[PDB]
Design a protein around this motif. Structure first.
Motif, mmCIF file in Angstrom:
data_model
loop_
_atom_site.group_PDB
_atom_site.id
_atom_site.type_symbol
_atom_site.label_atom_id
_atom_site.label_comp_id
_atom_site.label_asym_id
_atom_site.label_seq_id
_atom_site.Cartn_x
_atom_site.Cartn_y
_atom_site.Cartn_z
ATOM 1 N N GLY A 130 0.824 -1.212 0.000
ATOM 2 C CA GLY A 130 0.000 0.000 0.000
ATOM 3 C C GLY A 130 0.849 1.249 0.000
ATOM 4 O O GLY A 130 0.835 1.967 -1.000
ATOM 5 N N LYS A 131 1.554 1.544 1.098
ATOM 6 C CA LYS A 131 2.581 2.590 1.135
ATOM 7 C C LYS A 131 3.751 2.089 2.008
ATOM 8 O O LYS A 131 3.514 1.193 2.824
ATOM 9 N N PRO A 132 4.966 2.651 1.867
ATOM 10 C CA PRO A 132 6.142 2.303 2.662
ATOM 11 C C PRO A 132 6.051 2.805 4.100
ATOM 12 O O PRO A 132 5.101 3.498 4.463
ATOM 13 N N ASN A 177 5.163 8.544 7.776
ATOM 14 C CA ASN A 177 4.049 8.282 6.871
ATOM 15 C C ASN A 177 2.727 8.467 7.634
ATOM 16 O O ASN A 177 2.492 7.735 8.606
ATOM 17 N N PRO A 178 1.830 9.376 7.210
ATOM 18 C CA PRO A 178 0.568 9.607 7.899
ATOM 19 C C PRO A 178 -0.364 8.384 7.884
ATOM 20 O O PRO A 178 -1.219 8.287 8.770
ATOM 21 N N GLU A 179 -0.195 7.439 6.952
ATOM 22 C CA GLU A 179 -0.900 6.165 6.891
ATOM 23 C C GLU A 179 0.038 5.094 6.315
ATOM 24 O O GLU A 179 -0.173 4.547 5.225
#
Length: 37
Positions: free
Chosen positions: A1-3, A32-34
Protein backbone atom coordinates in the motif's frame (compact mmCIF):
# COMPACT_ATOMS: atom_id res chain seq x y z
CA UNK A 1 0.00 0.00 0.00
CA UNK A 2 2.58 2.59 1.13
CA UNK A 3 6.14 2.30 2.66
CA UNK A 4 7.16 2.92 6.30
CA UNK A 5 8.16 6.55 5.47
CA UNK A 6 7.22 8.99 2.68
CA UNK A 7 9.64 11.46 0.99
CA UNK A 8 9.70 15.26 1.23
CA UNK A 9 8.88 17.16 -2.04
CA UNK A 10 8.56 20.51 -0.16
CA UNK A 11 12.20 20.53 0.93
CA UNK A 12 14.72 21.84 -1.63
CA UNK A 13 18.45 21.85 -2.37
CA UNK A 14 19.77 24.19 0.36
CA UNK A 15 20.16 27.89 -0.54
CA UNK A 16 23.77 27.40 0.77
CA UNK A 17 24.40 23.88 -0.75
CA UNK A 18 27.77 22.97 -2.32
CA UNK A 19 27.01 20.90 -5.44
CA UNK A 20 30.74 20.87 -6.33
CA UNK A 21 31.57 19.38 -2.86
CA UNK A 22 28.73 16.93 -2.23
CA UNK A 23 27.13 16.42 -5.68
CA UNK A 24 23.62 15.02 -5.48
CA UNK A 25 21.38 16.55 -2.87
CA UNK A 26 18.68 14.22 -1.45
CA UNK A 27 15.56 15.46 0.41
CA UNK A 28 14.44 14.47 3.89
CA UNK A 29 11.38 12.31 4.52
CA UNK A 30 8.19 12.49 6.59
CA UNK A 31 6.71 9.99 9.03
CA UNK A 32 4.05 8.28 6.87
CA UNK A 33 0.57 9.61 7.90
CA UNK A 34 -0.90 6.17 6.89
CA UNK A 35 1.78 3.50 6.87
CA UNK A 36 -0.25 0.30 6.48
CA UNK A 37 2.12 -1.76 4.39
Amino acid sequence: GKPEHIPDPDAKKPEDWDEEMDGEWEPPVIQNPEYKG
